[PDB]
Amino acid sequence: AKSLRASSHLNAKSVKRRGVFQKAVDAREQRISDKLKEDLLKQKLEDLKKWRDGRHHTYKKAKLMKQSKKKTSFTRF
Amino acid sequence: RDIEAENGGAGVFNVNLKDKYLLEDDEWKNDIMPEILDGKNVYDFLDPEIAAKLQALEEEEEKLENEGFYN
Amino acid sequence: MGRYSVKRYKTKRRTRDLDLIYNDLSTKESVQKLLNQPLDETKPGLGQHYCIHCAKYMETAIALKTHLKGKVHKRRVKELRGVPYTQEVSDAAAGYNLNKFLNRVQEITQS
Amino acid sequence: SGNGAQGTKFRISLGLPVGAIMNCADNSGARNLYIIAVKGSGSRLNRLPAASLGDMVMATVKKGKPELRKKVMPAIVVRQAKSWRRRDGVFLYFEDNAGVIANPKGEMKGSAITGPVGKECADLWPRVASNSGVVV
Amino acid sequence: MRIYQCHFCSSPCYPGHGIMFVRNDAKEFRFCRSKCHKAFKQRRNPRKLKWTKAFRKAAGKELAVDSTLTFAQRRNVPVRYNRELVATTLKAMARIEEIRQKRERAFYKNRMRGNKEKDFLRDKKLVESNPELLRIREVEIARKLAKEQE
Amino acid sequence: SHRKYEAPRHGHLGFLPRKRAASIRARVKAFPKDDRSKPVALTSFLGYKAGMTTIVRDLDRPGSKFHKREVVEAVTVVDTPPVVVVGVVGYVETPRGLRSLTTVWAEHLSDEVKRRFYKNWYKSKKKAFTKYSAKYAQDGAGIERELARIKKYASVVRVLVHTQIRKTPLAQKKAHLAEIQLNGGSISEKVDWAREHFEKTVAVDSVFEQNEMIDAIAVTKGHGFEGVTHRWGTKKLPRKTHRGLRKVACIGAWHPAHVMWSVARAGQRGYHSRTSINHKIYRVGKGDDEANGATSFDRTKKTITPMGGFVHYGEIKNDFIMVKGCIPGNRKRIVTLRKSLYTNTSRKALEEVSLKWIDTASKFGKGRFQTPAEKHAFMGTLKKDL
RNA sequence: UGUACAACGGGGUAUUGUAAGCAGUAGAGUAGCCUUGUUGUUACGAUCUGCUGAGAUUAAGCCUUUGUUGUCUGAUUUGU
RNA sequence: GCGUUGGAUUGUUCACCCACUAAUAGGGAGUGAGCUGGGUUUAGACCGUCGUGAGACAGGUUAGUUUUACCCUACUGAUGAAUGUUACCGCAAUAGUAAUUGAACUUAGUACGAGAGGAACAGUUCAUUCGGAUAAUUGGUUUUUGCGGCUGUCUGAUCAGGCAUUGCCGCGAAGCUACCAUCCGCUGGAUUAUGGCUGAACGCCUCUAAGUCAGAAUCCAUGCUAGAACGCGGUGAUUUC
RNA sequence: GUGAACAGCCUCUAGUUGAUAGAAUAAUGUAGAUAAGGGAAGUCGGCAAAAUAGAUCCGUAACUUCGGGAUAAGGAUUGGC
């Protein structure tokens, strides 16, 4: 009966989202974030056991001069 | 129904069958009984007085040793 | 898997199993039921002329008498003399319900 | 599911297409049933409506009591020769595929069932479970 | 869940493995694999097929009557739960497997005692019977030592 | 003349063209919606599909017919050693779409990544990032400039990770590099996190955890040129039909005087990129932890590696992800595991998974034993033993 | 020029179903032989039993490898 | 948007019949030498009617060769030259798009009802059809000719083998594979009919004129597939005698 | 040699090893097989395949021109020693 795109069932889903489901998502995420912090701490703890530049400037200037010299510019003529 | 109603509804209330059975200790009310170990059915080896049969086996086996069964 | 085995041993063509036949042979009441049987329009010979061991029906007393002198009947008779292979035997062979297997063998041998 | 069926039915492998003779497990006097239709089946183009354990069919009594033949009564499949899966994983099958005569509301015409009855059919049909001496 | 045993070869059929056959008697027949299932459908005797445990028990290839093999039975009447009882059960099972492996090693050694002298009788009969290649052998070691000087 | 009997289309028109995927590693075309309130997290991961096995699960699904009943499930084991961050990419939001603004790499890159940048690694001088490590020497002025640029302008930050493929049983030494988007935290927080991580690894349990629904994005198994009867499921024509029976019979009408794009034709099957969503994580294993494959119902103390290893894949020595059901792609294949793009509202996404048992029997035959110890104790002593 | 790769080998893991050879009284019986006897005996004899879940196969798109032996080399082209 | 069946029947088709189904809607382009059945079915033959006849018909019955593409285009898949070279990581114009239906617990034997009977939303569980994958398991398959056996013959016998157009039989890993196996398939805007708000036209009124709220499986996006081979970005290395 | 056989299959004497080859093993074909459960529901039509099949023994209907039908039908067997 009621389709996937059904407004009624989607609205029941949306009411349900904000309850137990988003709670469980956010709590799960907090736990995984703490595990990541543990992981980085362990790794740093084993660690203690021991323009942009001239390249990009010439690159861009050449590219723009080639586009102006072959008449192939999106932005200028 | 009342506990079922305040915990989520008919199909959402996950009934704990464990919190109503009768033991010598409520602290092992929710403890998991193992089913399998090294290819053997734990339930089928499960027996009251298993210590008695086990100790009789141990006596017989160390007798077999001291009699010289694995020379 | 081939042709012959799948042709003969379908669950459609599955015949009576040996332990069931052993239990048919076990008591005098069941055997005397199986011999003096009610008439049955579907079964060959109207249900008379039954070979208990082979668990198949013959069309007449001639076909039964000829059946009892054949190597097929001998092969079936030999298959049934000892202790029928039940789940007791496949259980105790791995160390499981070994006691009931053993005393079942004793009961079979004594009766 | 059907009328008189208790709750949902999960998928099991279809064993009995239309035109399949199946044994009559009950004692209503029929000796075999001939599936002419299957309840609940979808409309796929060349697909024969097929029946499985626990499914209600429409069957004619082809051999047996003359008071029952030439009539089309509902039947409920209780055994099956096609191996299907049980969720506590095991694929199982019976030696024959059989059914029982039921009125469309689920009640057994017979007063008993002989031979085993699958638990997927006993569970789904209370009047089958209540008339089956052997389950699984 | 539990391990059932193949009705043919007594092998462990774990959950999800093999198939089962149910007769008109509610007697289930578990099979560990299609090999045993097909051999059963073909009415083959498992007590005459050497690779089954039933054959090895009936012929005496493996020990059959033992104290360690009686502990695993199907417990019809159950017992109430108890952590101490079940932990002693797990320890018991760990002990029983060790003792039964030792006893089956002993049984196999008993079965294969006597192989040494019979194999030696075969070797002595072969060496007695074939002295000509023994002379050939003597010559080959003689060549070996004559070569090994430098 | 109208179609006499209405039947639905064979196949899906949204999975077209059924061509070979442009790369073996399937792209992630969408990442979960960024929520800056949450802390910084990785939205995907990279692992290798090891194989499949069988699970008994103690199902707690209230309202079900299998409620409070053990159910046997098939699962897929994805070998997931930790991936290590090596770079950042900042994306600006432009009226023609997202645009990579800049990319900052770690100071030291392993051989595994550097191999990814060569077709002929053995012949090379291995000069991969030699002029780029020097940007860290001059107190990191260029590195800091591009990171400040990401902070100033980027509206999407993606980290660059890669797999320690040497930890897998794979013969391939060329690691797999990818962009993983960072969700949570502001742009500056994303960049600072990533800078802190430029040579540290990220374990799989720092991205996913048990009882989470994840998406599997992988290029499927390839089958070569395959005909209509099985590329689309078209019915076989009657026996000994002239010109053959494994092909579609009529192709077109008198008009449009062409074969339409919708008519099923033969061609490449498989090796297509697919995104399969909502795969429940049944176990996030740990590499160092022996008894990966043991549970609280099964005390055998065994790892998830089947006897004989997996088939066409070695052992599982690493962290792994075991997901319910089957996954696109075959074994040995790089898969991308993604966080779910939406807060799923099914009750399956909420369930805690309670395994009773993992099938570690051999996949190289009709395996009947879980451990070599069990096989030995069931066989008895052999002739190799005295 | 190496935790390299390869060809073999070893170990697992899987498939079959108990190898060749020898022995045995185990064996329907039939011949012969005398100690004419109850395992009488010498020979044949499908098959059976013991060595022996043995033997074979096992990546060719299985896993692993403290072993052995060898290889690491040519050709072509590409510049803002 | 999405589905619209299985059979029985007779020159066929509809009809009609039986049933299943959510429903078994009606049509176009249809598939005249893609494949096929009857008929246009040509020389054989038989019977009927007519004709003096040869014969032809009011008929009826029967048997009866038909042959792309290797060309172009379309379509399905697959390469690919050059825009310094080379490598990796991406963007997204455009184009395609997909999910579907049933009933089950609960709401309930409640609303509603003399009574017979008897809903639904919210909360849940499965299944039908479709689709996309996958091979843990089960089943199928076997030139693994992997193992074993059988027949006939040949290599003097044993061994070990040959041949029998893959000899046959049993089991058979791996691979392939099956609703014959298993998993997975969503959520935001804007609207239609309609229901309204404010409010003139028209000193009443009015959902409409200005303005505006809600609202269909609709549309457009999200998500999913391809990636413009003449769309683009970021980044790495850029030849020493 | 097997076998009833100048059948099929294997071999001795004699003859030949000639038919463009090599490498892969996609779809579709040509030729040949196997397939769970059901068993004609497929089709214009059981087309094609399957099933049957040698020999011995038991037994064998209607009808009939009394000759047949008839290998009717339906059963029981088959190795080795």
Swiss-Prot record, chain A:
Regions of compositional bias (Basic residues) in chain numbering: 54-77
Matching Pfam families: YBL028C_N
Feature: compositional bias, Polar residues: 1-11
GO cellular component: nucleolus; nucleus; preribosome, large subunit precursor
UniProt region (Disordered), positions on chain: 1-20
Family: Belongs to the UPF0642 family.
Note: Present with 6210 molecules/cell in log phase SD medium.
Name of this chain's protein: UPF0642 protein YBL028C
Organism of origin: Saccharomyces cerevisiae (strain ATCC 204508 / S288c) (Baker's yeast)
Curated annotation (Swiss-Prot), chain C:
A GO molecular-function annotation: ribosomal large subunit binding
Location of region: Nuclear export signal-like (NES-like): 17-31
Keywords: Cytoplasm, Metal-binding, Nucleus, Ribosome biogenesis, Zinc, Zinc-finger
GO CC terms in record: cytoplasm; nucleus; preribosome, large subunit precursor
The UniProt record lists the keyword Nucleus: yes
Main location: nucleus
Domain of life: Eukaryota
ZnF region ranges: C2H2-type: 49-73
Motif (Nuclear localization signal): 7-16
GO BP annotation list: ribosomal large subunit export from nucleus
N-terminal signal peptide: none
Subcellular locations according to the entry: Nucleus; Cytoplasm
Keyword set includes Ligase: no
Family to which this protein belongs: Belongs to the ZNF593/BUD20 C2H2-type zinc-finger protein family.
Function: Involved in pre-60S ribosomal particles maturation by promoting the nuclear export of the 60S ribosome. Involved in positioning the proximal bud pole signal.
Quaternary structure and partners: Associates with pre-60S ribosomal particles; released from the pre-60S particle very early in the cytoplasm.
Extra facts: Present with 5630 molecules/cell in log phase SD medium.
Protein name (Swiss-Prot/TrEMBL): Bud site selection protein 20
Native species: Saccharomyces cerevisiae (strain ATCC 204508 / S288c)
Phylogenetic classification of the source organism: Eukaryota, Fungi, Dikarya, Ascomycota, Saccharomycotina
Name of the coding gene: BUD20
Residues of the full protein shown: 1 to 111 of 166
Curated annotation (Swiss-Prot), chain E:
Keywords: Cytoplasm, Nucleus, Phosphoprotein, Ribosome biogenesis
Localization: Cytoplasm; Nucleus
Biological process (GO), any one: assembly of large subunit precursor of preribosome
CC terms in the record's Gene Ontology section: cytoplasm; nucleolus; preribosome, large subunit precursor
Domain of life: Eukaryota
Similarity-based family: Belongs to the eukaryotic ribosomal protein eL24 family.
Protein name in UniProt: Ribosome biogenesis protein RLP24
Range within the parent protein: 1 to 150 of 199
Swiss-Prot record, chain F:
Modified residues annotated as Phosphoserine in this record: S23, S155, S296
Post-translational modification: Methylation at His-242 by HPM1 is required for proper 60S subunit assembly and promotes translational elongation fidelity.
Inactivation phenotype: A mutant confers resistance to trichodermin, a trichotecene toxin produced by plant-pathogenic fungi.
Site of covalent link Glycyl lysine isopeptide (Lys-Gly) (interchain with G-Cter in ubiquitin): K38, K135
InterPro entries: L3_arc_euk, Ribosomal_L3_dom_3_arc_sf, Ribosomal_uL3, Ribosomal_uL3_CS, Transl_B-barrel_sf
Function: Component of the ribosome, a large ribonucleoprotein complex responsible for the synthesis of proteins in the cell. The small ribosomal subunit (SSU) binds messenger RNAs (mRNAs) and translates the encoded message by selecting cognate aminoacyl-transfer RNA (tRNA) molecules. The large subunit (LSU) contains the ribosomal catalytic site termed the peptidyl transferase center (PTC), which catalyzes the formation of peptide bonds, thereby polymerizing the amino acids delivered by tRNAs into a polypeptide chain.
Family: Belongs to the universal ribosomal protein uL3 family.
Protein's UniProt name: Large ribosomal subunit protein uL3
